[PDB]
Amino acid sequence: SEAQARRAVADIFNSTLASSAIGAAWELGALDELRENGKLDVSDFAVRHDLHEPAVVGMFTALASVGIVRREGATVVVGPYFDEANHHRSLFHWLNQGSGELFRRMPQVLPNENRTGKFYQRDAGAISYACREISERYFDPAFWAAVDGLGYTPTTVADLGSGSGERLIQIARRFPGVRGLGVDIADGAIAMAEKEVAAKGFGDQISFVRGDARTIDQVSARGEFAEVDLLTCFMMGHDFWPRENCVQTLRKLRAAFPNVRRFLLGDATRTVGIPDRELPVFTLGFEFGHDMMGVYLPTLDEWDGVFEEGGWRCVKKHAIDSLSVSVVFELE
Amino acid sequence: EVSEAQARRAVADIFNSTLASSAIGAAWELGALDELRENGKLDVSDFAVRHDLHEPAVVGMFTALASVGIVRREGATVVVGPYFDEANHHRSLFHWLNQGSGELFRRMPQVLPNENRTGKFYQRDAGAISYACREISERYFDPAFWAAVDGLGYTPTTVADLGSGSGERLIQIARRFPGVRGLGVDIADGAIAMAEKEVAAKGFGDQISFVRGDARTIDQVSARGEFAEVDLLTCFMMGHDFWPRENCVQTLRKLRAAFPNVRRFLLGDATRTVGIPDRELPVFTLGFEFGHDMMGVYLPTLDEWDGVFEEGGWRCVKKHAIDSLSVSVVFELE
Ligand SMILES: C[S@@+](CC[C@H](N)C(=O)[O-])C[C@H]1O[C@@H](n2cnc3c(N)ncnc32)[C@H](O)[C@@H]1O
Ligand SMILES: C[S@@+](CC[C@H](N)C(=O)[O-])C[C@H]1O[C@@H](n2cnc3c(N)ncnc32)[C@H](O)[C@@H]1O
Ligand SMILES: O=C(O)C(=O)Cc1ccccc1
Ligand SMILES: O=C(O)C(=O)Cc1ccccc1
Ligand SMILES: O=C(O)[C@H](O)Cc1ccccc1
Ligand SMILES: O=C(O)[C@H](O)Cc1ccccc1
Ligand SMILES: [Ca+2]
Ligand SMILES: [Ca+2]
Ligand SMILES: [Ca+2]
Ligand SMILES: [Ca+2]
Ligand SMILES: [Ca+2]
Ligand SMILES: [Ca+2]
Ligand SMILES: [Ca+2]
Ligand SMILES: [Ca+2]
Ligand SMILES: [Ca+2]
Ligand SMILES: [Ca+2]
Numbered sequence: 001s002e003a004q005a006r007r008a009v010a011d012i013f014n015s016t017l018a019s020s021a022i023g024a025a026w027e028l029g030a031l032d033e034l035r036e037n038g039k040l041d042v043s044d045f046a047v048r049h050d051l052h053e054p055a056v057v058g059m060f061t062a063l064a065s066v067g068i069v070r071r072e073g074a075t076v077v078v079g080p081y082f083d084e085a086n087h088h089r090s091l092f093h094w095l096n097q098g099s100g101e102l103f104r105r106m107p108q109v110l111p112n113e114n115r116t117g118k119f120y121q122r123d124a125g126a127i128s129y130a131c132r133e134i135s136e137r138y139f140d141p142a143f144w145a146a147v148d149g150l151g152y153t154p155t156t157v158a159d160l161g162s163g164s165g166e167r168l169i170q171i172a173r174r175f176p177g178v179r180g181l182g183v184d185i186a187d188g189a190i191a192m193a194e195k196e197v198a199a200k201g202f203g204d205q206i207s208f209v210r211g212d213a214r215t216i217d218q219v220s221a222r223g224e225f226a227e228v229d230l231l232t233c234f235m236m237g238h239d240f241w242p243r244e245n246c247v248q249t250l251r252k253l254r255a256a257f258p259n260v261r262r263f264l265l266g267d268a269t270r271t272v273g274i275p276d277r278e279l280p281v282f283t284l285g286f287e288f289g290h291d292m293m294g295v296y297l298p299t300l301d302e303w304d305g306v307f308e309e310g311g312w313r314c315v316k317k318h319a320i321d322s323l324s325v326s327v328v329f330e331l332e
Numbered sequence: 333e334v335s336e337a338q339a340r341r342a343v344a345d346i347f348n349s350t351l352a353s354s355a356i357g358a359a360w361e362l363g364a365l366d367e368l369r370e371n372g373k374l375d376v377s378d379f380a381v382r383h384d385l386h387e388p389a390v391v392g393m394f395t396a397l398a399s400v401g402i403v404r405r406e407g408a409t410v411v412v413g414p415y416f417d418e419a420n421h422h423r424s425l426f427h428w429l430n431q432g433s434g435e436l437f438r439r440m441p442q443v444l445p446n447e448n449r450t451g452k453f454y455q456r457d458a459g460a461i462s463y464a465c466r467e468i469s470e471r472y473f474d475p476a477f478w479a480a481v482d483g484l485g486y487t488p489t490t491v492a493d494l495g496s497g498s499g500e501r502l503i504q505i506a507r508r509f510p511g512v513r514g515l516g517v518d519i520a521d522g523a524i525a526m527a528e529k530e531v532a533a534k535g536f537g538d539q540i541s542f543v544r545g546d547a548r549t550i551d552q553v554s555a556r557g558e559f560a561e562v563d564l565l566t567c568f569m570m571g572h573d574f575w576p577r578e579n580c581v582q583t584l585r586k587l588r589a590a591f592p593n594v595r596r597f598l599l600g601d602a603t604r605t606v607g608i609p610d611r612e613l614p615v616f617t618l619g620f621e622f623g624h625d626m627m628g629v630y631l632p633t634l635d636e637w638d639g640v641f642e643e644g645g646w647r648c649v650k651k652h653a654i655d656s657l658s659v660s661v662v663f664e665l666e
């Protein structure tokens with residue numbers, strides 16, 4: 001029906017603005033106001049946070065357009081999809097604020113002749129901000145379970161792809177007096193993690209170093225590697241692949257962290273067989289995005305292959321069904 | 333519970349709709365849409381090879397489109413979906429939203445705070461905007477624009493286009509009037525570059541030229557000698573940039589003075605709507621209003637345009653309604 005088609009396509013258009021707005025409204029404080037008080041006064045909010053009021057009105061109207069919010073007067077009210085969208089807001093942020101420039105440039109990123117050198121760009125600072133909540137909301141119950149089952153109190157912990165630095169911080173809050181080292185390949189991750197450990201008071205327990213975990217022998221921070229007895233790596237396992245490169249890299253890690261006992265690896269994985277009209281949140285963005293970036297994404301079943309060959313024993317495996325098909329491995 | 337399941341689907345639809353939206357503009361640009369339109373279907377691998385594209389990304393693009401109904405995948409093949417004809421109709425609007433204006437909306441957290449609203453506080457892609465607007469013009473404004481051209485009362489010899497963009501409006505004028513000289517003014521280098529490329533390639537290199545400038549201070553624009561020859565003036569999709577009202581009045585006068593031999597001035601634009609319920613917003617409107625509000629650019633209503641012309645030194649002779657794109661309009665001025 002021509003009218004159903006028109007309403008659908010309009011909804012597709014507006015969903016773009018709503019999607020971009022969710023992450024923005026989180027970052028700026030609006031989603032938190034609404035969860036707390038069920039409602040807010042748009043002018044008041046705009047003045048409180050010193051925001052351009054007409055743009056604010058738009059942001060909320062974009063949210064309203066798809067049911068996240070409902071406007072009555074100068075009041076914004078929690079809408080029927082508020083609780084779902086708010087729960088998942090870090091995913092929208094990662095898609096838009098974080099990875100938005102990648103998808104924007106689709107027509108320049110697909111042609112083979114452009115897929116050379118640095119042919120896409122994302123905002124590493126924003127990815128770090130999103131992934132900090134993605135960790136908490138989706139990965140944490142399995143991560144802490146694995147931490148509870150270590151068998152030992154760790155001393156020096158190393159985190160590959162540290163991002164916001166928040167994992168290392170939370171580990172230090174639990175094990176007071178541990179030392180932390182974060183390796184991330186991106187200047188914006190490093191910078192955010194440094195400001196964050198500084199603000200939060202751990203500046204002499206936790207350091208960071210810019211570096212590539214795939215070329216771990218070339219990372220500049222020699223000193224502390226051999227003292228590390230806990231290794232963590234979250235949301236970047238797939239950067240180790242294809243299969244050969246992953247095996248060789250896993251072996252380099254076992255060699256450069258001789259005294260690591262447990263290695264906790266958490267990641268999302270390429271799904272199989274999900275019908276197109278039923279893709280849950282995140283899945284399509286994760287898979288399409290990485291395919292655009294020329295970054296290999298293994299199935300869960302591919303991972304099983306590689307641990308023993310890379311010189312590691314897989315002791316425990318946790319399913320995370322809350323975020324596409326995700327997993328935590330406890331390796332030894 | 334129920335309901336929790338409905339909210340879950342609706343939010344997932346919003347997430348994937350972002351990907352579909354961005355893919356609509358892209359599949360347009362790379363020719364997947366034209367090909368699906370012609371043949372009703374295509375082979376994804378064959379399409380990747382013909383156009384030398386990274387095949388895994390190509391699968392994502394069609395999968396993104398398929399996630400919301402625009403297309404369906406059958407095996408290794410792609411087939412027209414139920415929302416195909418409509419998304420294809422409005423594809424230039426998505427291109428405008430994504431490929432053109434996407435940086436604006438991406439940076440909403442850094443664009444809204446007043447403390448940052450200084451200097452170059454947002455970025456868009458002027459080339460891409462030109463590309464999309466070329467089709468927006470043909471798809472939504474042409475009927476009314478050629479009605480106006482037909483009813484000029486004379487045959488133009490020199491046309492100036494303000495906010496020239498792709499340069500395609502000047503090209504089409506020249507097709508219709510083999511005599512005419514054309515001059516386009518745009519404030520953006522990406523528009524100029526695009527339009528110089530287009531006109532050379534289409535063979536109109538010696539008839540049409542372009543100059544970088546700000547139509548708001550038209551009076552201070554370099555190629556002034558050529559302006560006095562002009563007998564048709566056009567302006568499409570940037571008239572709001574002349575606002576607020578006070579500014580629009582002064583600019584209207586500078587144009588009158590900068591173009592003394594202009595007989596007609598055709599002015600086309602989209603305007604700010606009022607009272608559309610949030611869940612009943614059609615395509616484009618929200619994007620147009622929210623984006624200009626983020627950019628800090630005034631958007632007059634239709635009535636607001638009516639006041640201003642006489643005060644700006646012009647008289648409105650004919651007015652066309654365009655309900656195919658938000659609320660849009662073409663004015664014939666004199
Ligand atoms: C999505 S994030 C997750 C951040 C963090 N681990 C967390 O749980 O919040 C993945 C991070 O890994 C980093 N990264 C990606 N490839 C890498 C590599 N080869 N070496 C080091 N870091 C990498 C990225 O810069 C990004 O900060
Ligand atoms: C939306 S586009 C339309 C392009 C073209 N007129 C068409 O109809 O396809 C608007 C154009 O206005 C130009 N523009 C905006 N403000 C301007 C100004 N103050 N002076 C000159 N050009 C301007 C932009 O560079 C852009 O190319
Ligand atoms: O940004 C990336 O490149 C990621 O891989 C991000 C990610 C991966 C898995 C879960 C959530 C985010
Ligand atoms: O890109 C802009 O700033 C525009 O004003 C675009 C536009 C305006 C009116 C109709 C179509 C596009
Ligand atoms: O092979 C697997 O499925 C996991 O990679 C790790 C594991 C293996 C055996 C028993 C438990 C966990
Ligand atoms: O004032 C108006 O309504 C239009 O701006 C132009 C117009 C005026 C009178 C008759 C026709 C057209
Ligand atoms: Ca209130
Ligand atoms: Ca509603
Ligand atoms: Ca582009
Ligand atoms: Ca970026
Ligand atoms: Ca290095
Ligand atoms: Ca190495
Ligand atoms: Ca779902
Ligand atoms: Ca379908
Ligand atoms: Ca941002
Ligand atoms: Ca900027």
Ligand SMILES: [Ca+2]
Nearest residue numbers: 435455456457
């Ligand atoms: Ca841009």
Ligand SMILES: [Ca+2]
Nearest residue numbers: 545546552553
């Ligand atoms: Ca100028």
Ligand SMILES: [Ca+2]
Nearest residue numbers: 006007010614
């Ligand atoms: Ca509609």
Ligand SMILES: [Fe+3]
Nearest residue numbers: 235236238290
């Ligand atoms: Fe990744």
Ligand SMILES: [Fe+3]
Nearest residue numbers: 569570572573
């Ligand atoms: Fe505009």
